[PDB]
């Protein structure tokens, strides 16, 4: 039993605060974009031949064109303005915990896992240190993961052969914190 | 190089006769409009204290999406959508400590059409205590995303599966979690 999907997006892309703004009104059928309005172009353009009838018809309606030429201001910049306070400026601290992946004796290889969870926004740096010196090799990362609820998590692992006396530090820099957070694991 | 993106995403699907209207900020959902109750649903409740939205405008948009669908189905000669089945991930939202409350997250990704049946299984039995879910979320490539949530109490004694049905899958997909 065949399915047929009609999909549309209206997109506001923001650069350098709201100094540059790009607005798109995009029309899709069954995963195929076929006609769109790009604010950098100023009229509708067919993305595929299946959208040619719409780009020609829409572009002949002059009040529609000027309506869509103002969206950058009265839709993009307006909506950024009224949601900026709880989205663009949302800051939630990461919780950092360090733990070995397996309980191992010393002088055997092991993955040292730095868990960073609950944080917003998504941009973050996680570094690994051994006795104060930064480990640039041996680092494995799951990447940034959306939890779907306005928080992120990530797992950053260090390939080690722990020896007694060694100090490993997981350091996290995020916009929500002034000072980098650091968690230690002692061998 | 862009700092942020706000996306107003909507669809209407036949023959399910099912629609969606939602807003997306940098991949997270600000809100959507419940098609049954015709009202704005904020993804975090604090959002409803900082902002408003007229749900009737979303509904008027869905009416055009519907009209556009019948027009575009005829114009394409009734070519059906190609099913793309999802990849499913299960993870917890914090590091697991035995006997301390936590949340299982079933992340359903890179699929179209935006229809799934999703079931949480605890030791093979369905569970609905405290489950929540998101609507279908947009992707740059125009496949869809969806999250399902299960509060639970970690224990050496239980095992969990997120079970996903989708028309591009020959059989239901189970994605397993245990301590």
């Amino acid at each position: 039993r065949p399915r047929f999907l009609e999909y549309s997006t209206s997109e506001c892309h923001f650069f350098n605060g709201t100094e540059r703004v790009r607005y798109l009104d995009r029309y899709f059928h069954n995963q195929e974009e076929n006609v769109r309005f790009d604010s950098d172009v100023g009229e509708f353009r067919a993305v595929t031949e299946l959208g040619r009838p719409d780009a020609e018809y829409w572009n002949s309606q002059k009040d529609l064109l000027e309506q869509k030429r103002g969206r950058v201001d009265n839709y993009c910049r307006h909506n950024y303005g009224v949601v900026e306070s709880f989205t663009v400026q949302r800051r939630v601290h990461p919780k950092v915990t360090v733990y070995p992946s397996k309980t191992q004796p010393l002088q055997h290889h092991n993955l040292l896992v730095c868990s960073v969870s609950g944080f917003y926004p998504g941009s973050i740096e996680v570094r690994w240190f051994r006795n104060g010196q930064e480990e640039k090799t041996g680092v494995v990362s799951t990447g940034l993961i959306h939890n779907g609820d306005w928080t992120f998590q990530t797992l950053v692992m260090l390939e080690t052969v722990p020896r007694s006396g060694e100090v490993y530090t997981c350091q996290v820099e995020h916009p929500s914190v002034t000072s980098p957070l650091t968690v230690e694991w002692r061998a | 190089k862009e700092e942020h993106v706000i996306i107003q995403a909507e669809f209407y699907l036949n023959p399910d006769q099912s629609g969606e209207f939602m807003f997306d900020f940098d991949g997270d959902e600000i809100f959507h409009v419940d098609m049954a109750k015709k009202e704005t649903v904020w993804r975090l409740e604090e959002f409803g204290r900082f902002a408003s939205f007229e749900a009737q405008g979303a509904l008027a948009n869905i009416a055009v999406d519907k009209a556009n669908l019948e027009i575009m189905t005829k114009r394409s000669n009734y070519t059906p959508i190609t099913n793309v089945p999802p990849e499913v991930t299960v993870l917890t939202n914090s590091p697991v400590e035995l006997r301390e409350p936590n949340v299982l997250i079933c992340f359903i990704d890179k699929f179209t059409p935006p229809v799934v049946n999703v079931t949480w299984l605890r030791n093979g039995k369905p569970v609905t205590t405290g489950v929540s879910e998101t609507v279908f979320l947009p992707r740059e490539d125009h496949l869809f995303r969806k999250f399902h949530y299960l509060p639970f109490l970690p224990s050496t004694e239980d095992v969990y599966d997120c079970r996903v049905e989708h028309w591009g899958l020959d059989e239901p997909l189970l994605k397993h979690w245990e301590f």
């Binding site: 009104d25 018809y57 309506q67 969206r71 | 939205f53 556009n68």
Partner: peptide, 13 residues
Amino acid sequence: GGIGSDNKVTRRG
């Protein structure tokens, strides 16, 4: 103030 929606254009039939 209101979060506003963008209007969807009807296609040519």
